[PDB]
Write a protein that binds this ligand. Structure first.
Ligand SMILES: CCCCCCCC/C=C\CCCCCCCCCCCCCC(=O)N[C@@H](CO[C@@H]1O[C@H](CO)[C@H](O)[C@H](OS(=O)(=O)O)[C@H]1O)[C@H](O)/C=C/CCCCCCCCCCCCC
Ligand SMILES: *[C@@H]1O[C@H](CO)[C@@H](O[C@@H]2O[C@H](CO)[C@@H](O[C@@H]3O[C@H](CO)[C@@H](O)[C@H](O[C@H]4O[C@H](CO)[C@@H](O)[C@H](O)[C@@H]4O)[C@@H]3O)[C@H](O)[C@H]2NC(C)=O)[C@H](O)[C@H]1NC(C)=O
Ligand SMILES: *[C@@H]1O[C@H](CO)[C@@H](O[C@@H]2O[C@H](CO)[C@@H](O)[C@H](O)[C@H]2NC(C)=O)[C@H](O)[C@H]1NC(C)=O
Ligand SMILES: *[C@@H]1O[C@H](CO)[C@@H](O)[C@H](O)[C@H]1NC(C)=O
Lengths: 98, 242, 295, 201
């Protein structure tokens, strides 16, 4: 088993009020069975699109979650990931300054 | 584990619909039909898989139709029939469509004729061994002659004392036309059986030449006032001479 | 030089539950996807069929469909023979394709990993275990090699089909493979990590093809303490990359992020830290916070 | 033609060797199959040969040279069971659903060695009524070739090989008959190259 690495980032510069796309890049995991959730203020985003699952040179799996979003000064965005290698779901919050 | 074909031989009149049956190998996916003219050139006709035709040759006319319904034979229909369609039809099945062994069936001998008036069964006669040969070689060769049969639908077999023998038997591979100049000439076939002089000299030994002809069905109409040339057996017998 | 990759993901939970999903890539572009629920291989680009005729593609799909079915039956049966008896869950991954070289030169490959560990390869005319693979695999391999129709099919797929298909695929999708997508850059700062230090982030997004150059500069002097991050994919089949610089308070002045990429055409993105373009970007990208780092 | 085979026909002694040759005229038709059909049956595949070099399956070896599109078949220790029509089929490269492209085939005839030939022609009388007569040319060597009939009234069959399993004896035989009363066994087979040591009753 391999613990997944979650990376949350916007497609275009995080200008407020401007429609953008928020990406969540889950990598370095094994087995391929995973549950990826995208959150808006801790509430499940419904229209989340997923990339087809694939794997890297080291046989470890990778997947890209992404949703259309209009970032604001006051809202928070996160990626909740459930995987066999973890006892508790990991939640990485979108931090546009990193 | 063998591709089966029903019937072995079939005689049909021009224009009529004919169905050639085939039972492929169980677990095989890709099915085939081949046409073989005069036991020489083997011609591909059709490739059938998933319930559709996957590949067809130029030889696969609009008269030909192929299908495999669930629980029944892989068939080949010919409607209407033409004189040129007289050939041996081979069924074949494989696990793959290419690069894997195709398993062939015994084939069906289709014979499309202008009129069935040309169909004649064989006249079988056994020729007793030469007394010269018995004294010169101490071996007795007896020859069988099957004559005046049309079409080339014959199976010759030797029967000694009620049992079919294969040792010392030599049937001709292909028969000969009585009139090679004629388009529709009756064929003739011969076979030879050799036994020791001591065996032939015994008058208690019974030697029989059996010829199985593949003629017409009861469905076919016979207008001419002669015996019907059906799928019959014409056997000729002889005893040992002391 | 391009590499064509068919990535098969097979998962076996029990004697009844199994799942086989495949994804196909020509370089960093997805060309196909074949999910268990779909009975046919689906194209992800207009040029995914390459220069193959509809009949040619159909013939290929038919054998692939037969393969998927047979492959599940075959593994489920080899699981019974495998020791220890039934080690569920079973994770089998298959990596097959060819690498294209100039001219008619190409090199095919078929690699298999059991439980995420590379164990088997198809080499020449037979399936073979790789050095280090578990000794119990030798028997199922001998059994696999008995299938004459499988070795013949795999040989044609690898030797002929793969390079022939890719040759026509590169021709059909050249416009899309040779696409130049302009990057876009922006700046940010975070109080990480050592006391009295501030990390300066340079974000670069939407560039294609993959190779770039992102460096923090102080005039013409390349700042040696630049940490380039990993390439992160975007949904539109472009790339994201970031460069960080840890600097003491006030040392931010005079710094600039320089971005060099093929699509720009010599007109490099230069973002000056402190500049009006920078203040005007900062002003529209603000949010409510305090920073946390896990890395 | 797409698949050229040589020779048209071949005759090999028992225990002897036979080489069969086959060439493809199309560069795409580079993958080969060797099929064998016994007179009046459905063909049986001997072996496939998709990679260059030799493929030995017992007494049978197939060699391939894709570079020159040439495939061959070598039979060692030829047996009478090997007497058949040898077909060379070619499969098109990168085509997953296709038929076979057979050549005209090679007629292979495995003949036996005659230790002591006693060539003679005998007159055989019918079992039912003497009205019919046949001429049997038997016990001749394998070198002797029975030639085809010139006269249309007289029919002469091709050479035939009998095997007396119990006795371990084999003999060649030709049969001739005529509907015409003006027929003699001495003045029969005249068109054929019969040896001078021939016996006549
Ligand atoms: C490879 C790339 C080529 C270019 C194609 C581009 C298109 C891209 C789109 C789709 C990608 C889909 C994902 C798949 C990736 C490709 C690689 C897969 C491997 C190919 C396998 C082909 C052969 C196959 O399906 N064999 C299957 C069926 O075999 C047949 O079964 C029959 C009975 O039912 C008979 O026994 C038969 O015997 S015969 O002698 O009479 O013919 C025999 O051939 C077989 O089940 C599977 C074998 C693969 C085993 C690999 C596992 C080893 C590691 C543990
Ligand atoms: C698909 O591609 C693979 C390669 O990636 C290919 O496998 C190779 O096929 C060739 C030929 O069939 C093999 O080469 C032979 O190897 C042996 C020894 O290893 C040699 O005996 C061979 O013969 C040579 O030697 C003779 C002298 O004694 C010469 O007379 C003769 O001319 C030869 O030079 C020959 O070199 C090779 O082993 C494999 N490669 C591997 C890794 O196994 C395969 O054939 C292709 N399949 C298809 C259907 O095209
Ligand atoms: C998708 O995954 C499932 C899981 O095995 C496959 O469903 C099985 O398929 C066969 C034949 O259709 C059935 O006998 C089984 O009952 C199914 N098993 C289960 C657990 O559902 C399915 O075949 C795969 N999808 C496709 C298109 O093949
Ligand atoms: C087989 O696997 C599935 C899901 O992984 C599970 O729900 C199912 O109960 C399993 N079968 C049995 C008999 O437990």
């Amino acid at each position: 088993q391999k613990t997944p690495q979650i990376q949350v980032y916007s497609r275009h510069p995080p200008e407020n009020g401007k429609p953008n796309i928020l990406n969540c890049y889950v990598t370095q995991f094994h087995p391929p069975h995973i549950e990826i959730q995208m959150l808006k203020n801790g509430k499940k985003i419904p229209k989340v699109e997923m990339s087809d699952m694939s794997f890297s040179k080291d046989w470890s799996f990778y997947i890209l979650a992404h949703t259309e979003f209009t970032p604001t000064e006051t809202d928070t965005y996160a990626c909740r990931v459930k995987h066999a290698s973890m006892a508790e779901p990991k939640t990485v919050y979108w931090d546009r300054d990193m | 584990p063998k591709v089966l074909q029903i019937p072995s031989h079939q005689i049909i009149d021009m224009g009529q619909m004919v169905t050639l049956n085939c039972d492929p190998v169980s677990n095989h996916l890709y099915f085939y039909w081949y046409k073989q003219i005069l036991g020489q050139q083997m011609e591909f006709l059709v490739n059938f898989y998933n319930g559709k035709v996957m590949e067809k040759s130029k030889l696969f006319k609009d008269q030909f139709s192929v299908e495999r319904p669930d629980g029944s034979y892989f068939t080949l229909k010919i409607q209407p029939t033409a004189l040129e369609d007289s050939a041996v039809y081979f069924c074949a099945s494989s696990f793959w469509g290419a690069y894997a062994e195709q398993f062939f069936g015994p084939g069906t001998r289709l014979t499309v004729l202008e009129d069935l008036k040309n169909v004649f069964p064989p006249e079988v006669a056994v020729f007793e061994p030469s007394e010269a040969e018995i004294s010169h070689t101490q071996k007795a060769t007896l020859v069988c002659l099957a004559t005046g049969f049309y079409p080339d639908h014959v199976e010759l077999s030797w029967w000694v004392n009620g049992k079919e023998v294969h040792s010392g038997v030599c049937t001709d591979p292909q028969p000969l036309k009585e009139q090679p100049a004629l388009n529709d000439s009756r064929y003739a076939l011969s076979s030879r059986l050799r036994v020791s002089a001591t065996f032939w000299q015994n008058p208690r030994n019974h030697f029989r030449c059996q010829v199985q002809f593949y003629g017409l069905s009861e469905n076919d109409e016979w207008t001419q006032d002669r015996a019907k040339p059906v799928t019959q057996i014409v056997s000729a017998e002889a005893w040992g001479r002391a | 030089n391009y590499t064509f990759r068919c990535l098969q993901m097979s998962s076996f939970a029990n004697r009844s539950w199994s799942r086989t999903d495949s994804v196909v890539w020509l370089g960093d572009l997805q060309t196909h996807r074949w999910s268990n629920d779909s009975a046919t291989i689906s194209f992800t680009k207009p040029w995914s069929q390459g220069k193959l005729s509809n009949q040619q593609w159909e013939k290929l799909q038919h054998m692939f469909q037969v393969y998927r079915v047979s492959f599940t039956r075959d593994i489920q049966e080899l699981v019974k023979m495998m020791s220890p008896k039934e080690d569920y869950p079973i994770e089998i991954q298959l990596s097959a394709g060819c690498e294209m070289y100039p001219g008619n030169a190409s090199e095919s490959f078929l690699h298999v990993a059991f439980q995420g560990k590379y164990v088997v390869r198809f080499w020449g005319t037979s399936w073979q275990t790789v050095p280090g693979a578990p000794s119990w695999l030798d028997l199922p391999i001998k059994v696999l090699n008995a299938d004459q129709g499988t070795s013949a099919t795999v040989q044609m797929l690898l030797n002929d089909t793969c390079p022939l298909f890719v040759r026509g695929l590169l021709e059909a999708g050249k416009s899309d493979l040779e696409k130049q997508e302009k990057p876009v850059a922006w700046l940010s700062s975070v109080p990480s990590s050592a006391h009295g230090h501030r990390q300066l982030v340079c974000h670069v997004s939407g560039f294609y093809p993959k190779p770039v150059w992102v460096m923090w500069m102080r005039g013409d002097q390349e700042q040696q303490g630049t940490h380039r991050g990993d390439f992160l994919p975007n949904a539109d089949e472009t790339w994201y990359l970031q460069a960080t610089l840890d600097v003491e308070a006030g040392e931010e002045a005079g710094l600039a992020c320089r971005v060099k990429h093929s699509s720009l055409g010599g007109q490099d993105i230069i973002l000056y830290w402190g500049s009006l373009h920078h203040i005007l970007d900062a002003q529209k990208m603000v949010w409510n916070h305090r920073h946390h780092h896990h890395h | 033609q797409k698949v050229q085979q040589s020779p048209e026909s071949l005759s090999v002694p028992e225990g002897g060797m036979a080489s069969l040759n086959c060439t493809s005229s199309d560069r795409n038709f580079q993958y080969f199959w060797w099929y064998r059909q016994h007179s009046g049956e459905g063909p049986k595949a001997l072996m496939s040969i998709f990679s260059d070099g030799d493929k030995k399956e017992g007494r049978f070896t197939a060699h391939l040279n894709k570079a020159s599109l040439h495939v061959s078949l070598h039979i060692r220790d030829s047996q009478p069971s090997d007497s058949a029509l040898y077909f060379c089929a070619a499969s098109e490269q990168n085509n997953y659903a296709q038929g076979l492209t057979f050549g005209l085939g090679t007629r292979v005839s495995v003949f036996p060695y005659i230790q002591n030939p006693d060539p003679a022609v005998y007159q055989l009388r019918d079992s039912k009524s003497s009205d019919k007569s046949v001429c049997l040319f038997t016990d001749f060597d394998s070198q002797t070739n029975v030639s085809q009939s010139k006269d249309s009234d007289v029919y002469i069959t091709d050479k035939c090989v009998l095997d007396m399993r119990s006795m371990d004896f084999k003999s060649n035989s030709a049969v001739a008959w005529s509907n015409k009363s003006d027929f003699a066994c001495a003045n029969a087979f005249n068109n054929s190259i019969i040896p001078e040591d021939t016996f006549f009753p």
